Design a protein around this nucleic acid. Structure first.
Ligand code: K
Ligand code: K
Ligand code: K
Ligand code: K
Ligand code: K
Ligand code: K
Ligand code: K
Ligand code: K
Ligand code: K
Ligand code: K
Ligand code: K
Ligand code: K
Ligand code: MG
Ligand code: MG
Ligand code: MG
Ligand code: MG
Ligand code: MG
Ligand code: MG
Ligand code: MG
Ligand code: MG
Ligand code: MG
Ligand code: MG
Ligand code: MG
Ligand code: MG
Ligand code: MG
Ligand code: MG
Ligand code: MG
Ligand code: MG
Ligand code: MG
Ligand code: MG
Ligand code: MG
Ligand code: MG
Ligand code: MG
Ligand code: MG
Ligand code: MG
Ligand code: MG
Ligand code: MG
Ligand code: MG
Ligand code: MG
Ligand code: MG
Ligand code: NA
Ligand code: NA
Ligand code: NA
Ligand code: NA
Ligand code: NA
Lengths: 183, 260, 192, 71
RNA sequence: AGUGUGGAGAUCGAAGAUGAUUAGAAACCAUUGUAGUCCACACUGCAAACGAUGACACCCAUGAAUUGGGGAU
RNA sequence: GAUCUGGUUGAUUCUGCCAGUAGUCAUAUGCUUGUUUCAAGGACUUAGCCAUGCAUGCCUCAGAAUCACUGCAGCAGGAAUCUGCGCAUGGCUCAUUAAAUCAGACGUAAUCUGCCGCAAAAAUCUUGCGGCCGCAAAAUUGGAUAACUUGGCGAAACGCCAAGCUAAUACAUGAACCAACCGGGUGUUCUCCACGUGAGACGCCCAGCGAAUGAAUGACAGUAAAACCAAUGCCUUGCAGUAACACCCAGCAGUGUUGACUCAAUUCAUUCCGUGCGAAAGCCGGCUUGUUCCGGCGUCUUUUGACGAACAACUGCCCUAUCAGCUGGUGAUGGCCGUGUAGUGGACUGCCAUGGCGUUGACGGGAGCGGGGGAUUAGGGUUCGAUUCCGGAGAGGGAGCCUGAGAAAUAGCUACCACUUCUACGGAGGGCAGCAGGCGCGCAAAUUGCCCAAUGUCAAAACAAAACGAUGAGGCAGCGAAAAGAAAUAGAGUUGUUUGUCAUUUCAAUGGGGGAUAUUUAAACCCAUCCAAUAUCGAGUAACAAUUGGAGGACAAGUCUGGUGCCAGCACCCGCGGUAAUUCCAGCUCCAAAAGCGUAUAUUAAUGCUGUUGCUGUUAAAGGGUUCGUAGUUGAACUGUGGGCUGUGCAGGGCCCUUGCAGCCCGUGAAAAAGAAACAAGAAACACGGGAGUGGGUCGCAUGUCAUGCAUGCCAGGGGGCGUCCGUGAUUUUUACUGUGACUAAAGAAGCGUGACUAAAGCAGUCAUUUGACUUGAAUUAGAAAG
RNA sequence: GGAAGUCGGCAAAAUAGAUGCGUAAGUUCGCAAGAAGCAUUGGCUCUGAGGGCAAA
């Protein structure tokens, strides 16, 4: 009753439920990137589709069209700052050829593993889930945190986490209480 | 009649979020139309931020602190529309309401003794009882004895303190005008030629300082000076020029980067 | 009650309008005055907006104006002699706008003598009593003005035809003007 | 419009013929509208003529326009 | 084909009759035969009423023919 | 992502449907459910029926208190009750409803309009003193009636009488002088001039706003000179100059507006009878405390401009012809005079004339409240919209009406029909399609919860101080697998059994959860912070144990089973089952999705199986038996290569030709001043200061001086050129289309910017740490058709 | 009260003139039809409408 906030959707199920090629390809993306289910991939697919559709529209207008000149320039900034597109790729046609693995490459769970912080991509997810990593000195507890290129050098352990400037973690805390009580 | 005004039905220039309030201050009748006015509660709370709530807004207004056209107003629903001098002596704000290039309301701060100088556009010329020529203006004021050369469409600069008109600016080509309606509203430009269609609306072709050729209905223009170079009163900070949106985007991105 | 809306009317196509709304006070009607000749009886009506309408029931006098002389006098109403709507309104002596009436012609005779010094019959005004300065004024007016025989004969008889120009059921008064020119000659044929 | 019928007294019927565009089929269709117009004795138009009408107050159940020219 | 009213009624022939065939066979076959079939006037308007192929217009490769009108020898 | 697959045959290629497949803020249901954010929620059917409680009331410096009310010592609060304002807004629901409602765009010059803004206001014979007269002047007006008291009636009743006081800003009456300008009608009135458009004073009758009737204004704008006569100006004793005016006013209006007004406003004549008008004959504050103190209010009239109301209608708006004619006694289309209305109008009476609508679908019938919008979609489209914003309508069904500015009002009245409740049987009551909640209906849908803290509404009203307004509107919680975003169920090792599985040995970490110095919050609950800062609990089967359908094909997953033996069954379709079941009824494993997954019914895509884009008609379904033939659709060519010069392109076969520039009376004629020829209505010929902010470009001296004449000129003239207005003239030119622009509510959909930790969001916020910058931002779009 | 009387509505009752509106099945399209049914009606005092002849 008179509630006025949007709640949209971010994913779509595949049209053909049982494709051997699609099921095996999606299972490869799950283990290789450490995802809990296929909805993360389908979220990525919807994310990539939307940029593709608006790009498709922009390339039909002349390069001097103010809508093309403004929204084309904007979508380049969105691609470069989030690391999706290489900075020397300046044309609007390189957005079209964007791929699914490129988007998950910028996920924090991927970047944490690739920076040497996490030995495995599954270690990265739980480590992020356990408030152990801070981006620009801000705790992030979400594996799907797409990181900008300018914030890549600020990735570190959170100053509150046991691995760093914070107090000791749970195991070193509960067992210490056990020894003191046993006295 | 109706007394409530819904949040969504409220004018967009008031900048009230659709999540905080279900209702909005319905502007009680007065000098300005409720579609073209900021209620004195909205002005004192959402624009000047002197009031935290609406309950703290009635505290200020009922005290008689807020002066409009050299007159204290106590009702929070007071229209307090365009080209009015608002003064709060406790803080000495002494600003007037104007329209910026994007068409929104602007609290243009005024200098000392500039508050006395105020303009208003003649909308109707008629005789009152006893053969008295009377001119009513966009503010709703009635001038009992105007200039013999004053016509409809001209603006008289009117002294609020003296309660007397001091000069007249006739609506002709080659004058400085500011648009008051539509998306074109808030742009200062020069009347190059006005096309007169009897019965229907009149079309005013304008040309601002930068050379942009734009038009609008003649009921939206407001003479503000004799020429584009010299204006009677101060205008919002953009100087009435709407620059390109792409260049609007580039400069603010550069300025934001210059901070870092 | 009585309504003035178009919902009960047939469409120009002849179809029947299906009404989906109850009657409204903003479209009401009232019962007519049927104002008759008699001693002054009126009834106020509280119209919309607080204003009062004076529903006249009977009337006997009103200001009747001589148009060609820009003069008007209060006279009593003697009879109603013509109605363009129906004979039943004449027969019942119903006072409505544009109805032809007969009024007392005495004040117009007194005024004419006081103004031009021409007593048509020739308390009562005496022309010869006027100071000698006045006859100079009368001579100036007599060259400016020339009266019609048809009207003058009506003054001599004592009753003059007139036409009601007010709405008795709306304003509560029965004012009129005297029939002059071709308008009078139009109604004389019907009355004959 | 065009004078359609002059069979009343001081009143004429005019036709406003126009083409309506159907968006789905990308094509037009001929449509017409009828108006009852008061005609002064200064004009005396004929069937098939051409008139200019102007909007006035309700003059009758159907009349809201008055003849301004006859072409 | 059927209907109405007047004709006509040679042949053929729904219905019907008789004889065969047949397990049965007023079916195919045989001999007949009414209405029809033919005409005038008036109805009906139901076809494999078909080229199972709507009408109008333009372009369109080849050989031998065919019907009507023209031109040349 | 502009996508298909299984089923007709012994096989084949088609047509064609069935079945499959994905989505739905799309409903129900079955199974299952650890965290968090954001949420729809008795619409579908019965606009069915309902107990209870609440939902619209309101007071301060500022209308009224002698509460036998309170506290102090007359003051300050102040119940009740008059008075004033509001209750016509909000909130529900969607029954009615197709030239109606509605959307966009226009009107009201056809009107009404409380609260709110800005203005205007000279009518008025009053009062205290002696007998209408005289004196005098800060006007020292009059009756009620509330509350309250007494008596009370009545079962009760949001029921009632009678008597005594008593107020107000309730009701009524009424203010002469101080205090003007202004004109009309007059006097057998007085002073004069010659012997009447003569002049001057004085007496009286009217000359206020508004309303009624009538008369005049509310402009002209297509000619130049003389006589003549009467009157009146002047010079002096005949017409040059010259506003108008027989003074106390020597310019105190010869000039409203609109596109257009019978409008605004002014003058003249008659009129206002309750159906109008006070300086409320009002209240409160300040100082210098004033028969002239200065403010804040409050109110009656008049006025317009805002907030609204009502009416009208330019284009648009589902299915149906097994609905073809509709309307017109007794209004149907129009006219005349009226009536009624706030106003126009056949809205209505009387009288006239036959009109008005329809195959471009009238009339009738059926389903529906209309938009903004939702779902789906390559595009075109198809479909849904009771539901939060806007418009309309209703309050069981009907119909009438009072008050009020505004109601045909319903938590207002009156009546009838259906139902209904209390009663002392005399009688009196009711209207949840408000909130919360019951019964029935159903496949189907929350708590008789907290609070005015935010947003707003009303109100006599800032807050505070004996001093705290109402609010089931609304906000915040409970229930809530409609739906949506982020996300648990674990991360690493050493040894043995290139990898990899399995049995070990462990290691560290976080959350669910338990709490708090506390934070949030009206208070709470939720989230966020923390497990001491000297001092804050907890995961190893990390039992803090994941389900729903399947495993012949479509369609990912088995030579395992075991029975039934065409049975029991499965199976959306094809099919499985008749004793070695591919399909049945279970284990394991495996598959798919996953805190989610089946089933049913609708709808979109699939579907080029509705085809405008974009289908098919020989034989698959489908060209009418043939001609004629109206509406309807479609419809053949033609007014039409512009030329020259310089430079330039692998030009090409002095000429033609791309690109760039300058010329062209830009066919021919006839001379670009003129005239002529083309044109030119956005043109030309007249003609208007009341046309141009003083008649547009091109420092003392003339007028005159009883003049704020303190005013005018200071180039003379001519000539054309133009911004405005009017009249006269083209044997008069539009529309579709297309390019720009104006006009156009949010919510919703795109989109710029924005690390709300991310996202679904929101329009915020960022920085130095500062007594503030960013003169912070809140961009831009699209949104049918018609105008 | 209303056919319960009686073989049986026998007999009686009942409807009724004129004007306007309205009228079903069936049909040989002519009818059925006065189908069936509603409504008005008096007396007075008026007002309209419907004509003949003569005159430049
Ligand atoms: K949405
Ligand atoms: K207008
Ligand atoms: K035979
Ligand atoms: K009251
Ligand atoms: K009329
Ligand atoms: K609504
Ligand atoms: K099985
Ligand atoms: K098309
Ligand atoms: K055929
Ligand atoms: K009976
Ligand atoms: K018997
Ligand atoms: K009968
Ligand atoms: Mg025959
Ligand atoms: Mg035979
Ligand atoms: Mg056939
Ligand atoms: Mg065929
Ligand atoms: Mg077959
Ligand atoms: Mg299917
Ligand atoms: Mg409402
Ligand atoms: Mg409905
Ligand atoms: Mg809708
Ligand atoms: Mg419904
Ligand atoms: Mg209602
Ligand atoms: Mg009900
Ligand atoms: Mg009601
Ligand atoms: Mg109720
Ligand atoms: Mg009721
Ligand atoms: Mg309820
Ligand atoms: Mg087996
Ligand atoms: Mg299924
Ligand atoms: Mg579909
Ligand atoms: Mg389709
Ligand atoms: Mg398709
Ligand atoms: Mg097909
Ligand atoms: Mg076939
Ligand atoms: Mg052609
Ligand atoms: Mg030439
Ligand atoms: Mg939005
Ligand atoms: Mg008998
Ligand atoms: Mg019949
Ligand atoms: Na046989
Ligand atoms: Na054939
Ligand atoms: Na032939
Ligand atoms: Na087969
Ligand atoms: Na009997």
């Amino acid at each position: 009753m008179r509630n006025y906030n949007n709640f949209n959707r971010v994913w779509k199920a595949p049209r053909r439920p049982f494709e051997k090629e699609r099921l095996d390809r999606e299972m490869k993306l799950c283990g290789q990137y450490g995802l809990r289910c296929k909805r993360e991939i389908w979220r990525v697919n919807m994310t990539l589709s939307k940029m593709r559709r608006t790009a498709r529209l922009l390339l039909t207008l002349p390069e001097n069209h103010p809508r093309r000149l403004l929204e084309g320039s904007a979508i380049m900034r969105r691609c470069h700052e989030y690391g999706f597109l290489d900075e020397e790729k300046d044309k609007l046609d390189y957005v079209l050829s964007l791929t699914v693995p490129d988007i998950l490459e910028r996920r924090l769970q991927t970047i944490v593993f690739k920076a040497g912080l996490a030995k495995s991509v599954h270690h990265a997810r739980v480590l992020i889930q356990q408030r152990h990593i801070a981006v620009a000195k801000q705790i992030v507890t979400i594996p799907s945190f797409i990181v900008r290129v300018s914030s890549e050098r600020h990735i570190a352990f959170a100053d509150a986490s046991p691995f760093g400037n914070g107090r000791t973690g749970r195991v070193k805390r509960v067992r210490a209480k056990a020894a003191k009580r046993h006295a | 009649a109706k007394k409530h005004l819904k949040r969504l039905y409220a004018p967009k220039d008031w900048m009230l979020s659709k999540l905080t309030g279900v209702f909005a201050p319905r502007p009680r009748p007065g000098p300005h139309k409720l579609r073209e006015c900021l209620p004195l509660l909205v002005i004192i709370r959402n624009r000047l931020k002197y009031a935290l709530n609406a309950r703290e807004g009635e505290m200020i207004l009922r005290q008689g602190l807020v002066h409009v056209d050299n007159h204290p107003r106590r009702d929070g629903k007071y229209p307090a529309g365009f080209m009015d001098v608002v003064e709060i002596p406790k803080t000495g704000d002494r600003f007037r309401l104007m329209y910026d290039v994007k068409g929104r309301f602007a609290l243009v701060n005024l200098s000392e003794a500039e508050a006395q100088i105020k303009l208003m556009k003649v909308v109707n010329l008629y005789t009152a009882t006893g053969r008295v020529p009377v001119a009513v203006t966009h503010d709703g004021h009635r001038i009992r004895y105007p200039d013999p050369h004053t016509s409809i469409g001209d603006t008289i600069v009117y002294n609020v303190k003296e309660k007397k008109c001091v000069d007249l600016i006739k609506n002709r080509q080659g004058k400085a005008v500011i648009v008051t309606g539509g998306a074109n509203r808030g742009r200062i430009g020069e009347i190059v030629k006005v096309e007169c269609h009897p019965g229907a609306f009149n079309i005013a072709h304008l040309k601002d300082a930068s050379g942009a050729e734009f038009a609008t209905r003649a009921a939206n223009i407001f003479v503000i000076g004799k020429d584009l170079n010299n204006l009677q009163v101060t205008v919002p900070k953009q100087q009435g020029l709407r620059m390109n949106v792409i260049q609007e985007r580039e400069e603010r991105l550069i300025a934001a980067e210059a901070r870092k | 009650g009585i309504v003035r809306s178009r919902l009960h009317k047939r469409k120009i196509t002849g179809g029947k309008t299906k009404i989906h709304r109850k009657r409204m006070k903003a479209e009401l009607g009232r019962l007519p005055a049927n104002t008759r000749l008699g001693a002054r009886r009126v009834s106020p009506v509280r119209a919309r907006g607080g204003n009062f309408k004076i529903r006249a029931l009977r009337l006997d006098t009103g200001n009747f104006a001589w148009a060609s002389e820009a003069i008007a006098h209060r006279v009593r109403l003697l009879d109603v002699v013509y109605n363009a709507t129906s004979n039943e309104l004449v027969r019942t002596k119903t006072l409505v706008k544009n109805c032809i009436v007969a009024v007392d012609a005495a004040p117009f005779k007194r005024w004419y003598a006081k103004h031009y010094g021409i007593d048509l019959d020739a308390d009562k005004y005496d022309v010869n009593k006027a100071s000698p300065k006045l006859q100079r004024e009368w001579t100036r007016r007599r060259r400016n003005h020339r009266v019609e025989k048809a009207i003058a004969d009506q003054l001599r008889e004592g009753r003059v035809l007139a036409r009601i120009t007010s709405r008795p059921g709306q304003s509560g008064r029965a004012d009129g003007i005297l029939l002059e020119g071709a308008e009078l000659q139009f109604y004389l044929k019907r009355l004959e | 419009g065009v004078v359609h019928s002059t069979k009343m007294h001081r009143t004429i019927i005019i036709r406003r013929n126009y083409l309506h565009f159907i968006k789905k089929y990308q094509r037009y269709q001929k449509r017409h509208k009828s108006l009852a117009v008061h005609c002064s004795p200064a004009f005396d138009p004929k069937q098939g003529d051409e008139v200019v009408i102007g909007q006035c107050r309700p003059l009758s159940k159907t009349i809201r326009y008055n003849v301004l020219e006859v072409v």
